[PDB]
Amino acid sequence: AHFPDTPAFTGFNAPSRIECDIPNLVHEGTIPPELNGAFFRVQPDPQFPPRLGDDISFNGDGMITRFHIHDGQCDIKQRWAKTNKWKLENAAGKALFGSYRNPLTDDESVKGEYRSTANTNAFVFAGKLWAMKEDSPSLTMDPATMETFGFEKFGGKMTGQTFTAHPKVDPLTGNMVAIGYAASGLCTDDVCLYEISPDGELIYEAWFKVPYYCMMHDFGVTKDYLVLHIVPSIGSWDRLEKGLPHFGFDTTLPVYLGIIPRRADLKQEDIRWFKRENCFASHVMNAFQEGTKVHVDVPEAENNMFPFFPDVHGAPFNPQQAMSRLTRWTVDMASNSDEFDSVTRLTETAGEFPRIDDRMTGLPYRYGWMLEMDMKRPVELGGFLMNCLFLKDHQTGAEQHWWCGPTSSLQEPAFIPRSKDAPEGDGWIVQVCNRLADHKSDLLIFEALDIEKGPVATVHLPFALRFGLHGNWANAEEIGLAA
Amino acid sequence: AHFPDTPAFTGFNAPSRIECDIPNLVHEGTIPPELNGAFFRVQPDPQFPPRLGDDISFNGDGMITRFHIHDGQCDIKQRWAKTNKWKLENAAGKALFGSYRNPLTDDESVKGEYRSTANTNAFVFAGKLWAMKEDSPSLTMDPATMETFGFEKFGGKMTGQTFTAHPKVDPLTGNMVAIGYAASGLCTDDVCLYEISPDGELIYEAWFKVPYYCMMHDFGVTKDYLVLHIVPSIGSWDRLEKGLPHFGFDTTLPVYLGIIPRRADLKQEDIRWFKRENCFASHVMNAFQEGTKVHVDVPEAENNMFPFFPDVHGAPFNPQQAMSRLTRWTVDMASNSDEFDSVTRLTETAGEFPRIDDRMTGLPYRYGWMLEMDMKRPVELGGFLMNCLFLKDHQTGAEQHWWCGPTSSLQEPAFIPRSKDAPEGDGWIVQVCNRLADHKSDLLIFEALDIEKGPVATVHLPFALRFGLHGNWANAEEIGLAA
Ligand SMILES: COc1cc(/C=C/c2ccc(O)c(OC)c2)ccc1O
Ligand SMILES: COc1cc(/C=C/c2ccc(O)c(OC)c2)ccc1O
Ligand SMILES: [Co+2]
Numbered sequence: 025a026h027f028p029d030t031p032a033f034t035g036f037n038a039p040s041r042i043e044c045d046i047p048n049l050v051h052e053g054t055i056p057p058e059l060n061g062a063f064f065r066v067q068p069d070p071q072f073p074p075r076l077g078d079d080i081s082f083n084g085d086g087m088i089t090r091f092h093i094h095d096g097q098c099d100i101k102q103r104w105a106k107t108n109k110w111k112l113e114n115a116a117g118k119a120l121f122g123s124y125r126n127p128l129t130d131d132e133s134v135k136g137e138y139r140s141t142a143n144t145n146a147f148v149f150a151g152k153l154w155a156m157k158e159d160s161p162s163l164t165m166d167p168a169t170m171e172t173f174g175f176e177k178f179g180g181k182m183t184g185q186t187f188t189a190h191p192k193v194d195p196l197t198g199n200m201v202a203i204g205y206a207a208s209g210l211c212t213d214d215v216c217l218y219e220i221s222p223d224g225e226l227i228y229e230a231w232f233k234v235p236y237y238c239m240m241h242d243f244g245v246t247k248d249y250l251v252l253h254i255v256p257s258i259g260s261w262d263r264l265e266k267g268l269p270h271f272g273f274d275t276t277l278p279v280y281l282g283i284i285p286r287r288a289d290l291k292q293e294d295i296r297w298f299k300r301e302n303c304f305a306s307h308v309m310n311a312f313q314e315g316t317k318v319h320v321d322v323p324e325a326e327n328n329m330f331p332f333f334p335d336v337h338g339a340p341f342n343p344q345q346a347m348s349r350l351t352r353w354t355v356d357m358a359s360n361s362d363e364f365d366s367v368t369r370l371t372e373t374a375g376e377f378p379r380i381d382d383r384m385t386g387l388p389y390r391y392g393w394m395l396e397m398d399m400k401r402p403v404e405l406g407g408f409l410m411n412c413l414f415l416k417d418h419q420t421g422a423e424q425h426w427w428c429g430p431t432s433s434l435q436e437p438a439f440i441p442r443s444k445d446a447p448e449g450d451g452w453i454v455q456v457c458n459r460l461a462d463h464k465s466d467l468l469i470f471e472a473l474d475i476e477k478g479p480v481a482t483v484h485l486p487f488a489l490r491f492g493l494h495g496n497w498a499n500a501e502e503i504g505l506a507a
Numbered sequence: 508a509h510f511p512d513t514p515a516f517t518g519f520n521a522p523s524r525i526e527c528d529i530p531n532l533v534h535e536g537t538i539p540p541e542l543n544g545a546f547f548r549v550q551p552d553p554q555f556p557p558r559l560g561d562d563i564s565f566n567g568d569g570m571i572t573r574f575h576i577h578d579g580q581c582d583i584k585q586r587w588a589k590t591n592k593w594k595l596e597n598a599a600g601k602a603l604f605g606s607y608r609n610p611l612t613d614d615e616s617v618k619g620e621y622r623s624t625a626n627t628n629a630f631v632f633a634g635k636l637w638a639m640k641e642d643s644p645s646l647t648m649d650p651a652t653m654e655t656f657g658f659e660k661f662g663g664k665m666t667g668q669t670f671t672a673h674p675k676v677d678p679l680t681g682n683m684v685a686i687g688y689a690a691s692g693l694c695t696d697d698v699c700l701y702e703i704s705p706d707g708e709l710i711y712e713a714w715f716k717v718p719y720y721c722m723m724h725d726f727g728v729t730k731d732y733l734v735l736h737i738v739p740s741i742g743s744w745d746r747l748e749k750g751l752p753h754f755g756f757d758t759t760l761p762v763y764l765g766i767i768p769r770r771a772d773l774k775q776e777d778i779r780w781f782k783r784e785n786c787f788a789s790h791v792m793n794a795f796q797e798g799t800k801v802h803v804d805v806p807e808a809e810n811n812m813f814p815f816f817p818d819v820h821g822a823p824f825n826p827q828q829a830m831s832r833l834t835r836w837t838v839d840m841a842s843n844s845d846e847f848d849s850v851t852r853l854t855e856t857a858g859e860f861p862r863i864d865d866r867m868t869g870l871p872y873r874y875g876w877m878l879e880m881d882m883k884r885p886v887e888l889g890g891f892l893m894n895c896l897f898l899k900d901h902q903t904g905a906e907q908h909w910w911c912g913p914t915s916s917l918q919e920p921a922f923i924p925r926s927k928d929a930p931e932g933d934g935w936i937v938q939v940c941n942r943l944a945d946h947k948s949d950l951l952i953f954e955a956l957d958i959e960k961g962p963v964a965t966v967h968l969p970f971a972l973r974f975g976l977h978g979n980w981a982n983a984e985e986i987g988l989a990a
């Protein structure tokens with residue numbers, strides 16, 4: 025394959041496209057013998073060169089990595105998420121879909137097809153592996169064989185066109201809670217709220233509209249509510265016609281937080297929109313209720329964090345204003361005005377990729393993990409450099425940091441509970457480490473509440489993973505692997 | 508897996524064990540559209556840590572790499588050669604066989620099993636892929652699926668215990684010509700000569716004895732003769748009982764060249780042994796007859812080339828005396844004495860891994876390729892450093908060199924003929940290049956008689972191959988791949 029000689033395809037961003045199997049990877053330390061299950065993660069990875077001769081990282085085809093941990097060892101199985109795009113381009117031997125979220129650049133032969141790369145999350149629910157991309161229904165796969173099933177439209181009960189890559193699981197019911205924005209077509213202001221039973225059936229689909237179309241990448245869920253931030257990374261057909269990236273950031277638009285009842289009978293009038301001054305937030309650590317209030321914790325930045333989705337008025341990217349810090353947004357459903365109740369920075373540590381013990385989804389909670397950017401650490405070989413694992417204790421305020429060293433960077437952590445009813449945070453953290461000087465990757469295993477001593481086990485891969493997005497652990501009994 | 512922290516298992520020698528599939532590898536330059544077939548090669552690669560807690564490179568399990576070149580692109584498929592050793596240890600989840608060629612160190616549960624790692628050649632013949640190791644019958648595999656069949660004993664017609672890793676194909680008949688030393692048991696002085704028809708049937712097996720047991724790794728074949736050098740890398744049960752490496756080099760023993768008739772009715776008395784002073788030679792570029800004379804071209808060194816098979820009298824390894832240079836050994840079957848007719852150095856270039864256009868096997872020939880060690884080139888990051896591809900023209904004497912640069916090394920080349928009846932050397936050379944600074948490998952494609960301009964195509968693998976031994980190209984129609 026002849027790939028472009030541009031930053032998105034060279035160095036750490038070289039195409040990999042490895043499908044492989046390796047049991048009993050070389051490792052150091054002690055893999056806890058309690059672990060019996062697998063950690064799934066996804067990397068964008070282009071099957072074919074881009075039609076345009078350049079592209080962005082978020083547009084690569086989804087390649088799924090599974091780390092099966094059992095009997096004190098770690099195995100890897102890596103397979104493509106065989107979206108309709110993947111299958112059509114594989115059959116044609118060339119790229120047919122074009123630029124990111126831009127149907128105007130597709131070959132006429134794929135007009136009207138789902139454009140999904142399934143490249144943003146690898147999630148486990150209802151016995152299936154979900155390979156997810158927010159512009160289409162989710163792909164599903166067999167979590168044991170990692171064969172692909174197809175797109176999940178819930179027996180025709182789903183009429184929205186899209187499905188999130190950030191599903192939540194409500195611990196009170198076991199339901200998956202999801203959204204789908206641009207639900208009636210590209211750049212529309214319609215959004216769907218979905219709840220899926222543990223058995224994989226769509227319980228309900230509720231439609232509503234938002235203040236303006238924008239990237240609704242993540243959200244929060246509480247007992248009673250969908251918690252939906254409205255942040256002005258905006259897109260338009262006009263932008264696409266002019267050849268611009270789909271999204272661009274508008275510093276002049278307000279930010280909203282919508283509180284949407286989790287009810288099949290939802291009506292537009294039941295929603296409250298709270299309003300604040302312009303800022304940037306993408307991911308949600310967790311949300312929960314307290315009396316008549318709703319709290320949501322997000323990494324907040326002063327300005328845009330996506331340099332490839334540039335300032336719509338032509339401003340150059342500002343790296344310092346892109347620094348995000350975990351911040352609690354509080355709104356009161358009994359308040360008179362549309363103002364936030366409070367905005368409170370929870371740490372001075374800069375970070376992203378926030379995670380929790382997911383059994384606390386929607387509940388008051390004590391622990392949060394993040395990828396941290398410590399600009400004061402040496403780097404002995406641009407972009408965001410995520411060089412630490414970070415743990416925050418909301419009860420005492422204590423913070424823990426682990427630095428991966430001067431030639432490495434880190435990918436998103438994932439929490440593994442010790443058992444169904446273990447206390448919050450009783451378990452382990454796994455995460456990929458980019459060993460940039462060795463052009464390879466490790467899987468690190470930490471004791472989740474004691475990270476400053478470093479990982480208790482380091483699993484070496486004999487090749488490099490690419491930049492990853494989101495990933496999750498599932499116990500073996502949830503994914504058809506051995507007891 | 509917990510592997511030892513020793514040189515044979517770290518750095519470039521880290522275990523890999525990757526089984527994978529990747530079509531349409533990222534590449535540069537122009538892959539000739541004439542190419543339709545595959546290049547097979549093998550790397551020792553340990554499935555499990557060694558029982559002893561250390562080992563040598565030559566004892567790793569055979570991992571087979573196939574580069575399928577077609578339609579101007581290159582695909583890779585890599586699979587284990589599933590020897591009986593591989594299968595037994597896989598089932599047990601641990602190493603059961605011990606040190607190199609040392610049955611005294613095996614677990615009692617595998618007493619009497621073939622110890623083969625099938626790690627020395629990946630050869631194509633009679634529609635099968637041969638994964639070869641000189642201490643046992645050859646393994647065979649499906650060249651298209653790269654599944655394993657098992658050990659080839661030719662319907663019971665083979666009674667020798669061993670089969671070479673350096674088979675030759677006689678262009679006059681299409682027969683495979685092979686030997687098997689230590690044919691009646693470990694360290695015995697019996698050798699078998701085998702010829703196999705193009706249909707895969709054993710034509711004949713002829714037994715004889717050699718002057719002393721030693722590593723009979725390679726050999727030559729002419730129209731009338733097996734040409735067998737006797738070089739004193741010797742082994743013994745006594746060495747094994749004392750815990751020494753199986754082989755050690757004895758500088759005090761003579762070197763012989765045996766001329767053995769290629770005949771099923773062979774008798775010991777039909778053999779001529781020519782004798783010369785001590786030296787080291789392992790591989791054979793080619794052998795051929797001229798009147799009553801036999802010529803064989805080998806890389807000759809003053810002393811031992813295997814530091815892990817040390818001098819039997821305790822001398823430290825001598826790197827300078829291990830430098831090998833292509834040398835023609837000539838003997839005359841009509842001569843009165845046992846002296847060589849001539850010993851003539853053919854180049855001052857130091858090199859090994861000699862190859863020819865294999866259609867000239869056993870015939871007078873013009874071209875030879877080697878891996879070259881140019882000690883005068885910069886190395887910007889011990890062992891042999893093979894840093895050039897080398898081509899020798901026996902007709903004019905001309906020499907060509909291509910240097911892979913200061914941070915790379917090279918593996919064995921293989922010649923690809925343009926067509927069945929193209930002139931000698933009309934075709935291409937393929938070879939793996941170790942990109943040591945990038946911790947990855949390339950496959951290089953050269954115009955076979957014009958190498959100084961560099962490869963015409965460079966295929967990038969997104970991971971590193973390990974040290975390889977021998978490999979071969981086969982046209983697609985010979986290995987069940989598409990026309
Ligand atoms: C600062 O917030 C982060 C965001 C992201 C990516 C979001 C994302 C959005 C849309 C996509 O279509 C997509 O597809 C791959 C990805 C990654 C890391 C972060 O820290
Ligand atoms: C200097 O001659 C060379 C020899 C070799 C290896 C021979 C070999 C011998 C016995 C084995 O059992 C084996 O198993 C892996 C390998 C490799 C490169 C060279 O240049
Ligand atoms: Co995300």
Ligand SMILES: [Co+2]
Pocket residue numbers: 673724725790977
């Ligand atoms: Co050899």
Ligand SMILES: [Mg+2]
Pocket residue numbers: 178179224225
């Ligand atoms: Mg269904």
Ligand SMILES: [Mg+2]
Pocket residue numbers: 661662707708
């Ligand atoms: Mg047979």
